Amino acid sequence: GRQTYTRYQTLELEKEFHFNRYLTRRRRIEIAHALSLTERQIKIWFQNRRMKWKKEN
Q: How far is the CB of 16 from DNA (least distance, A)?
A: 13
Instruction: Please give, one letter per residue, the 3-state secondary structure of the chain.
Output: CCCCCCHHHHHHHHHHHHHCCCCCHHHHHHHHHHHCCCHHHHHHHHHHHHHHHHCCC
Among 10, 12, 17, 32, binds DNA (CB under 7 A): 10
2 lies in the binding site for DNA (CB under 7 A): yes
Please list every residue from 35 through 54 that binds DNA, using CB under 7 A: 40-41, 43-48, 50-52
Among 5, 12, 17, 32, binds DNA (CB under 7 A): 5
